[PDB]
Symmetry: C3
């Protein structure tokens, strides 16, 4: 049972506020002890800080909810960890049997195809797409309009640049870049 | 008049099941003679097998319906062949006077701009975009996050790779690749 | 108070008609003196002609409305100039504190992240994404599936090609191209 107010810890904060209000929260209290135990969310885009704050807030008896825009479409057979500080932005689609772990950010219009696993505290940017059966490690970043082809795995702590297309399995962490626009 | 049950021939099957249930089908019967004539769909991503199975099922007196997610936006002046085994996934947009032929797959968040023609049994992957007046041949594949610029034609049986941008007319079949992410 | 009919000045015209009807307009009158003063829209994709026609129509006492598809999601804290001939297509998302100026086109599934400024008479094509705090100059064109990374500015009168990813600030106008698909 979600509370009527929500604390938002953390730009990215106002965006999370919009998602909270979309869900039906009546009031958002920004933060950046003895307070009432309203639902909490951590609006920090940075994976490492988000995890640290997650641990601290959880240890002080707060429920860290998921913020999921009403327009996000989630398959009934998908698994989204409950009360796990996951952000799911508008027009995200999560297909059959995909699994989203705690603290993940799925930003606007990202797509998680069937049977994917998105590792804890990963950040999937606007328009990024994961094809079927893709495994994204913990603490990964997939840049804007990036994509990962079917059946591929990306190791923990990796970065996929904006516009970049991952085409091979990567069992060691790394940084994988796309081609930048060139001035003519 | 759609039936209350649907046979799904064919991962991709559970995804089609989700679209069927979204439309209002109450039950999905997976297959991979004397059966009741419920609506049928072919959930095979592969263009060539889909066509073969399409022909066989049609010859046995079954109706092969289109599965179109309620969130797919289709212009009133667009033409989508009726009862033609077309899959239209969530958040697809099909603009004025565009034409979608039998057996096409339009995957999640793909966009078909005004006056396009998408040839029979083509596969338009997640996030792929066709600009205005684009002609996609039969049996083509457009990869994830790919796109085709305005007024271009792509010959039958061609492949456009993930992330790739088609910039010239192609009247002969071919394979057109994008740049892969590079490890730094 | 929007009128029940709308004049559409200007392919792109039928698409604008669809958006007008989606909003609740009952009739669209195409044009390409003493007429009744129904709401007006300029359905010209070309930035320079759109501006000229905008000026002429405004000087003849017509209201040039915005056409905004019901599926476009606009943050309550975003600023969209009222009655400014702005087109906002289906599944566009405009996040907190972003600002959209007069005559802009935001085409299908484009995303304008928090705190962006999109300059007057710019054209953001299908699937193009602007990250947080991005400043797009007046009269710019961002091509299909293009994107601009966080905190960047693009000078007035610039062009970003289809599929291209802008990675650096650009305070002088230019043309910034992506990599085309290559035949194998």
């Amino acid at each position: 049972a979600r509370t009527e107010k929500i604390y938002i810890y953390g730009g990215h904060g106002l965006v999370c506020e919009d998602v909270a209000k979309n869900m039906g929260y009546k009031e958002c209290i920004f933060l950046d002890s003895t307070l009432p135990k309203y639902d909490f969310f951590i609006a920090i885009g940075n994976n490492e800080i988000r995890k640290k704050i997650y641990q601290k807030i959880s240890e002080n008896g707060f429920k860290i909810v998921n913020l999921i825009h009403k327009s996000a479409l989630i398959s009934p057979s998908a698994i989204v960890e409950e009360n796990a500080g996951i952000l799911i932005m508008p027009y995200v689609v999560i297909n059959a049997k995909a699994k989203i772990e705690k603290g993940v950010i799925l930003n606007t219009s990202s797509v998680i195809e069937h049977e994917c696993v998105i590792g804890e505290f990963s950040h999937v940017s606007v328009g990024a797409k994961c094809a079927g059966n893709v495994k994204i490690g913990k603490n990964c970043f997939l840049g804007i309009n990036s994509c990962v082809l079917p059946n591929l795995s990306l190791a923990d702590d990796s970065i996929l640049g904006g516009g970049a297309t991952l085409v091979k399995n990567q069992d060691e962490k790394g940084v994988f870049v796309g081609v930048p626009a060139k001035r003519m």
